[PDB]
Design a protein around this ligand. Structure first.
Ligand code: BRW
Ligand code: BRW
Ligand code: CL
Ligand code: CL
Ligand code: CO
Ligand code: CO
Lengths: 348, 348
């Protein structure tokens, strides 16, 4: 289309206003925190993504605030950001120029589902492993994503690299201070969120990540449900009824409800027959009523399901090498050093 | 299929165990409160619906308790109910034998949407009017449905009669006693429910009923949204941002959230051009942040949008007469007598 030139600031590094020109703008996503366009940086030819949200100017943008702080190979990189205005007065926009990634787990999963097939287990391990790695990263800053779903997981089909994106709902959780329970995409909401909890923790990202893993093994969302009551019923049909204890660990003030019938179901009678034992094991360890009983993200990466990735021979199905998975920084493993012995293979 | 014979009790009237035989059982619905089959009563040939829910036997079934109490031409009739057992011990089922209705607003709406068309406004008036009439009825018993959605609105395409069904989530609300906020189908949840409210009132059925009306005029759900945050954003784009007052009327204890941008949108820029002014008016009067500011169900029936139904000539598009709409009982209008002068036409 037309060429656009703005004064932008780099995301990370020294704050030095610089000139940026981009073109070939098309829309490629929407959200309750703005539009996402694809674009081409003029002078380098590189494709980028620009997310445009309306800004109050009277209040900071937390998405920007968080993004500036991150830097990890599994989280989409913020290149620059700039403001702009619209047709109407007192109407400023914040624009985040981020790396552009070709696919998203949501599409790759839909594409396979449409083909009446399941995603090759090797991809399942690779995508899920990188999701947990990122999850551990942002949690170590005390940041909870609050919106983990397949559409927010970017993929590069060729390199098999996954990148967490959309920090629109992200927030740094602090003990004692309350949080709204209405964030997070239906199918991925942790029980505590459905129950109204406002004192939940980062472990809600793990429940979600677990919903993603299960969805990738089943070919459809594992806990669908129009109402929260239906989701709770789907969940109870797989984990069994919650003990009074558990319901309390999810949401202290809670308000009792009916429910009852069926309890402690076959976790193995959930997935297709060929489903790898370890994949089901990881799910159980991820979808737990008690939030503190859920594996942490780093412990998830150390799970046996991800052993193939640690294998010295491992290669993508297209003969190419696997993405970065062991280059853990000391800071990255400091939350649970002992894991290093499983995280970093012998040949490293 | 096979013939089945049970000892059943009549829903309404004297409790006199009687023998019932039915056959031609097929499934026709599912839910978090049981399965719904279609069946044929042997000796009369009549088609009925049987909803089978697992029962605790140690606790009453509120759905049954409520259904026994109702009796109104716009609410599906309970004919009998009986218990039965399953393959496993300590596993009893409660079976509700109800009237069978051919269609549901959900299908009629999908069918038209598929045909790339909108439901004829006359049907919109007829269906919505009967929904409100029923809604007024159950509210007068202090019963809030809690699950008003198109799939729970049964229709008889020929007679154009609508019948409210599925009282699985229904409950008699009492001031002071708390209620869970996770009932109700996503798209139809009143803001107070999204905000976590546990002291909400029957007016939540009205917000839903309003979502239905709007969906029937647009051809798709008016407030879609994966997360509650997205729904709130869709809602704010049509009603404008909630004043601090309003947010308080929805949920006293609430926990603040980000949000902001856009406010007070064109209620008329929402629907197609040909959309009747009055239909949009009714919607505004139904989708109100402040719950007490929402029209009551009976006032909704008295709205101008429903004037065509009061017209002396009015006939279904198939030349047949319109269903019952004015036979209000004195008990029915006692909540707001003055409405009688608009409810019951001159020629009545
Ligand atoms: O390449 C991207 N970088 C992003 C950064 C953020 Br933050 C949000 C989205 C994107 C993004 C996206 N890339 C896509 C490719 C196909 C379909 C949708 C998207 C998308 N987004 O919807
Ligand atoms: O005719 C009916 N009486 C009912 C009473 C209760 Br309570 C719940 C459902 C029904 C019901 C139903 N009739 C249908 C016709 C087509 C598709 C679904 C249904 C259905 N139900 O899904
Ligand atoms: Cl590596
Ligand atoms: Cl009449
Ligand atoms: Co969003
Ligand atoms: Co239901």
């Amino acid at each position: 289309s037309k060429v656009t030139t703005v004064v932008a600031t780099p995301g990370q590094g020294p704050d030095r206003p610089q000139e940026v020109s981009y073109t070939d703008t098309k829309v490629i996503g929407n959200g309750s925190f703005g539009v996402v366009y694809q674009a081409k940086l003029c002078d380098s030819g590189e494709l980028v993504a620009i997310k445009k949200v309306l800004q109050g100017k009277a209040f900071k943008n937390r998405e920007l605030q968080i993004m500036r702080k991150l830097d990890h190979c599994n989280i989409v990189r913020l290149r620059y950001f700039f403001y702009s205005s619209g047709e109407k007065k007192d109407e400023v926009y914040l624009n985040l120029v981020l790396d552009y990634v070709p696919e998203t787990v949501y599409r790759v999963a839909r594409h396979y589902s449409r083909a009446k097939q399941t995603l090759p287990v090797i991809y399942v391990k690779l995508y899920m492993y990188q999701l947990f790695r990122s999850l551990a990263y942002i949690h170590s800053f005390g940041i909870c994503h609050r919106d983990i779903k397949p559409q927010n997981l970017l993929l590069d089909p060729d390199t098999a690299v996954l990148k967490l994106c959309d920090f629109g709902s992200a927030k740094q959780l602090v003990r004692g201070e309350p949080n709204v329970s209405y964030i997070c995409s239906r199918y991925y909401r942790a029980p505590e969120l459905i129950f109204g909890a406002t004192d939940y923790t980062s472990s809600i990202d793990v429940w979600s990540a677990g919903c993603v893993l299960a969805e990738l093994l089943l070919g459809q969302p594992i806990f669908p449900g129009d109402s929260g009551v239906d989701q709770l019923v789907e969940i109870i049909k797989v984990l069994g009824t919650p003990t009074r204890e558990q319901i309390r660990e999810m949401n202290p003030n809670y308000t009792e409800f009916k429910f009852p019938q069926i309890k402690a179901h076959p976790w193995t009678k959930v997935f297709r027959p060929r489903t790898p034992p370890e994949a089901i094991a990881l799910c159980s360890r991820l979808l737990e009523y008690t939030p503190t009983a859920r594996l942490t993200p780093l412990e998830a990466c150390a799970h046996s399901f991800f052993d193939e990735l640690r294998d010295p021979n491992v290669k993508l199905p297209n003969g190419r090498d696997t993405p970065a998975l062991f280059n853990f920084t000391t800071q990255e493993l400091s939350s649970n050093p002992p894991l290093a012995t499983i995280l970093i293979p012998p040949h490293a």
